[PDB]
């Protein structure tokens, strides 16, 4: 007979990242024994290369699939009410803007989706640049002519790295086991009679456990064979430095987002604004053999900034990010970004998660497919990974997250185009 929860060991691979750390957290909250939970990561939580290890992420509701609503409401409640998480949600509002007929029409539909989801009280439609300037007067009326916007009063931004770090502290305090670097870098599941009984890391260290979760984000499909259910892509950011005087003006600013332009955040406590552009992401295809592959594989393998910290971003990205600064913050259009880096996610075809047991390897569970939209689910997602581990995951969640190699083309996913490849977008490499 299988051990009871109190005696069930679980290895969480990628446990220094977003979904992994959440999974570890909820294992403990769910009454697994902390010392029976092992978090393994290539880098100490919060992992240097985790997409969650960031200054700032957007908190907001975005409804791409039906299951999105439930997950978003859970997340919102916890960012507002959970003592572990509350202090890292800055409820400054979210300004989701569009310009041009196509983008504006899509926004109008997005707005109505939010209403129909029951969020009318916390979302308003802004039908002119004047309405927009009321929620964010530091925008230039020159630059945002003909823009419209949804303002989500209930949105804002998340101090991402800090939130994960507080999860790490909690796990540490509770007695969770850690292995990092060589001791934490997953290479293979250990298998017996078609059952997963642990993992081996690059330094040869073996961990034995009743259950294994693979929450390795953009590395997941590089680590085990996922038949292109996930395709990993990079987005880009840079930082600009404000004087204390300049920063003070932008204090408590709503997040500003435009799908055709990018997005930026109020200054952190160091006077630093993070800016991203928006685009369909970049692959970096190469030859690589994930565990369980039965043929030569060309797949998108993250070019990790943590591994290659001299890397920057493509020249085209430097250009697009600068035009974003020019548009959003024209008075700053002449600042030089620094800390420019690529940040890695993995897209499924339908942009829903992949959270499911491996069809072959009993007790090995996938928890990835973040599809670039999942940091906000830090608080709650781990709970459902536990439900899946335990066989209690709701049918609608279970279906949406299921093993589905047949599902479609992740390279394009739900985005405007197939991702281009870093090989064809020069200027990021300085080896
Ligand atoms: C890139 C990006 C993503 C992003 C965003 C802006 C950018 C530039 N803006 C967002 C926003 O405003 N709001 C939001 O909700 N999400 C946003 N995203 C996406 C978000 O960052 C990601 O969807 C999410 O963080 C992904 O989480 P996940 O847990 O899937 O991935 P991770 O945090 O990267 O964790 C992966 C971990 O796995 C470890 N790893 C890798 N290889 C190994 C091996 N071999 N062994 C053990 N561990 C491994 C990594 O170290 C990492 O910690």
Numbering used by the authors: 1 to 431
The authors write:
N-valyl-histidine derived from proteolytic digestion of the N-terminus of the HbA1c β-chain. As members of the FAOX family, fructosyl peptide oxidases (FPOXs) are also known as candidates for diagnostic enzymes. A covalent bond is formed between FAD and Cys343 of PnFPOX as observed in amadoriase I (Cys342), amadoriase II (Cys335), and EtFPOX (Cys347).
N56A showed decreased oxidase activity compared to the wild -type, while its dye-mediated dehydrogenase activity was higher than that of wild type. However, with the movement of Asp54 and Lys274 in PnFPOX N56A, the corresponding space no longer provides enough room to bind with a water molecule (W2). Our structural comparison revealed that Asn56 in PnFPOX has a crucial role in assisting and stabilizing the oxygen path involving Asp54, Lys57, and Lys274 in terms of oxidase activity.
